[PDB]
CSV table of C-alpha atoms in Angstrom, one decimal:
chain,number,residue,atom,x,y,z
A,1,UNK,CA,0.0,0.0,0.0
A,2,UNK,CA,1.1,3.6,-0.6
A,3,UNK,CA,2.0,4.4,3.0
A,4,UNK,CA,5.1,5.9,4.6
A,5,UNK,CA,8.4,5.3,2.9
A,6,UNK,CA,10.3,2.4,4.5
A,7,UNK,CA,14.0,2.5,5.4
A,8,UNK,CA,16.3,2.1,2.4
A,9,UNK,CA,13.7,3.8,0.2
A,10,UNK,CA,13.9,7.3,-1.3
A,11,UNK,CA,12.1,10.0,0.8
A,12,UNK,CA,11.3,13.6,-0.3
A,13,UNK,CA,11.1,15.0,3.2
A,14,UNK,CA,11.6,13.9,6.8
A,15,UNK,CA,7.8,14.2,7.1
A,16,UNK,CA,7.3,11.3,4.7
A,17,UNK,CA,9.6,8.8,6.3
A,18,UNK,CA,8.2,5.7,8.2
A,19,UNK,CA,10.8,6.4,10.9
A,20,UNK,CA,10.3,10.1,10.4
A,21,UNK,CA,14.1,10.3,9.9
A,22,UNK,CA,15.2,11.3,6.3
A,23,UNK,CA,18.8,11.4,5.3
A,24,UNK,CA,20.9,12.3,2.2
A,25,UNK,CA,22.9,9.5,0.5
A,26,UNK,CA,25.1,9.6,-2.7
A,27,UNK,CA,24.1,7.6,-5.8
A,28,UNK,CA,26.2,6.1,-8.6
A,29,UNK,CA,25.2,8.8,-11.0
A,30,UNK,CA,27.4,11.1,-8.9
A,31,UNK,CA,24.5,12.9,-7.3
A,32,UNK,CA,22.9,13.0,-3.9
A,33,UNK,CA,19.3,12.2,-3.0
A,34,UNK,CA,17.4,11.6,0.2
A,35,UNK,CA,16.4,8.2,1.6
A,36,UNK,CA,14.8,6.8,4.8
A,37,UNK,CA,16.6,5.8,7.9
């Protein structure tokens, strides 16, 4: 179901994380996005 974003998944804001804790990790493209704790 389309609920909160689970850990390891990409999150837009810390207000959309299942754990309520969003972070910023680097990808392989050489960029940096936000995921869930």
